[PDB]
Structure formats: C-alpha cells, structure tokens
Amino acid sequence: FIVDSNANKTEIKKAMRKLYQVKAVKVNTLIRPDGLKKAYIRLSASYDALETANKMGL
Amino acid sequence: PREIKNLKEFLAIRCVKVKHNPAQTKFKVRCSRYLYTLVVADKKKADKIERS
Amino acid sequence: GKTVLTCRKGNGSIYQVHGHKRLGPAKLRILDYAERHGFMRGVVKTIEHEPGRGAPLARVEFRHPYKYRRVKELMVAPEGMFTGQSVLCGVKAPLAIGNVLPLGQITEGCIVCNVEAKVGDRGTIARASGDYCIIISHNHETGRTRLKLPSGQKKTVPSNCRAMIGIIAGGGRIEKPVLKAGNSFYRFRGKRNCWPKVRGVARNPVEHPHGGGNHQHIGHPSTVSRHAPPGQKVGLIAARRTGRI
C-alpha cells in the first residue's frame, strides 16, 4: 500500500485491521523516492493475502 | 540454541523437529525462546521417545 | 597602515590559550573558616603534568568542611610533594613542605611558593616552576610581612595571606637548550599561538612600525614611549636603558 507518509507502522496495522478486517503480522514501510510512503504489510497466515486482495477488487 | 542433555528434562518440555543422523538422532524441540535439542545416541531409545 | 600583530593578539581569537587538556585553575583551597582557625589535612593524590605548564600540579584531596563529600582540589606542587603526602593547610598548620599556612606565621627567611598577594585570593605569587619567594620580614605590629618575589623584587603583603612552603617543582626547565625549532613547537603547542616569532623588520610597512624598507632595519628608535598608542608600542617599550648590561 501507498499509505499516508506521516503514518507509522503501528497505525498501518490498526488500519488494515479496520479497512480490510485482517491482521498484519508485520508492516515494514518505506517512503518512496517520490515521497509517497509504501507499506509492505504481511498478513498473518490465518489471513490469505490473496483471498483478501481479490476481495479488494484487485 | 541451548542443548538439554538428560531425558527427564526433555520429556517435561511447541512443534519438535526430530532429525536422524548417521550415528545419531537429535530431537530439536522448538520453543518460544530456545531451540532445545536432545541428542540420542543408540536408536533403541531414540524411537523410545519418538513414538511418544 | 594595517593592524599590528601585537594588537591582534588582543582579539584573542587564534591567539587564545589552548587548554583543552589543562586541568583547570591551579589554586589554593578556598579560605575556609578551617583555614582561619585550624587546619585541613588533605592527602596529595596524584602529581599531574598540566600541558603547557612547567610546574607539576598536585591533587590534594581535602575532606569537605561542611558536608559529607570529599573535595579534591588542584594546586601547583612544591618540590618534594609526593603522592600520599598529607598536606596541612590552615593557620596552625605545622611548618613543612607542602603545608599552606599563614604568611605571617612562616618564619622569616624561609622560602615559600604559590604565595597569595591579596588575602584569600588563592595563591598568585611564585607559581612558575622553580620559583619561590623568601620571606624577608614580618611586622607583627602592623601585620604585614615583606617577601622577595621570584624576580629580585621586594613586596609587602598581609600576614593573613597564605603561602605554601618550599620551591615550586619542575625547576630548571629553562636550563636545557631547546635545540630544535620543532622542540619549541611543542612547548607552545600547549600554550598558545605565540610562535614562531617573525621579526617586525622582516614584515612589511603595513604590518609593523619596523617593517619595510630595502635593507631591513628599524628607521627610528626601537625604544617606544609608554604613551605610544597601540600599534605603535612595539620595539622596546618605555625602556629605561637599552644595551647589554
């Protein structure tokens, strides 16, 4: 996800939990050279990242 | 990676990795912190706890 | 013209004392009540070299007069001031090397160091290595002893003034020739940007009053007036006589 650049990791977990209803075992963000922040959030194994992404319209 | 040595402790102690070796048979008990291992030389007592 | 180097040292920019590795002021103990009515025993703890200074400094550790804490304190060492020595500062301190006792109680003729001119100022006279000042008189009726400054120079100070007993340590530095331009490079490394000293005649007419000209020579007497404005007061200043003596 591009995620708000001022957001931190713990807030991105709490946001995935609320927006997409899924746990994030980890969320290591980077801010892009362009200035957008980019989170790679890894889901808990109990949550598929595939079943969820397609549910997301992706 | 501490190594539990005596059996009495090991029977006291998540998912455990048995590993057969030539001339060995380790029991790598994983846990929250350490991967305890119990070496077991002769096989007659290796499956003696493996079948536990 | 242009600002003379004597004047620029007064900006004290590049020309300040170094002293990062200096241990701090090397003074006598604060003139406590204990100094004025008894004595304080401090043991010397360690004799240090203060870079840029000739005399070793001692680390006498007096116990604090008014509180539970011990007060290490630093003063230029009299010669023979070994570590573990118990210094005795105070009015009725015993008369021995390293002891700091009132100047009017020191015997006439005995030599003292790290003498304080004003009472209580914590030791200003006779502090350089090898230096000392003999007490040359007391005047108990007016409470002012005389003493001979390390320069052949008599001076009267109150007997309430403290002094340390003995010669300041590290005497005889100057006797050893420096030989190398590099050797004097280091004695001034810990001092200041004093050195090397370019001669003013070697300088330009802008730079110095002596500077300039074809043959390098001073053009006017080198013995300047006392009232000469700064930037002019170079050469021999208010000199009473010149010449080898």
């Binding site: 801010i31 050279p33 362009d34 200035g35 | - | -």
Partner: protein, 50 residues
C-alpha cells in the same frame, strides 16, 4: 550518499515528480500556449543543490 533529511528527500521527491513532460492533452485545449515543459530539469545540468 544515503544521508538525507526527509525534508530534503521530500524536496527532491517534489522536483522529481515535477520533472515530467507536459500532458499531451493539455496542448489540445483552446487558447493553449504551452508546448514543451520549460522547467524540465536534468541532474547532469541544472543542480537542485539540497
């Protein structure tokens, strides 16, 4: 090198996404004046010394 205050990274980030050719469709508007971007920057030429 690596070091950048994020404030400088936000600025190079700013100039980076600002360093783009004009949209094709902007030239097709009525009364349009713009053709080339007059503020194209190149790292080897103009320097954004930050």
């Amino acid at each position: 090198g690596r070091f950048k205050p994020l404030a400088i990274k936000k600025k190079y980030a700013k100039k980076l996404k600002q360093n783009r050719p004009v949209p094709y469709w902007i030239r097709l508007r009525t009364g349009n004046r713009i053709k080339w971007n007059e503020k194209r920057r190149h790292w080897r030429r103009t320097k954004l010394h930050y």
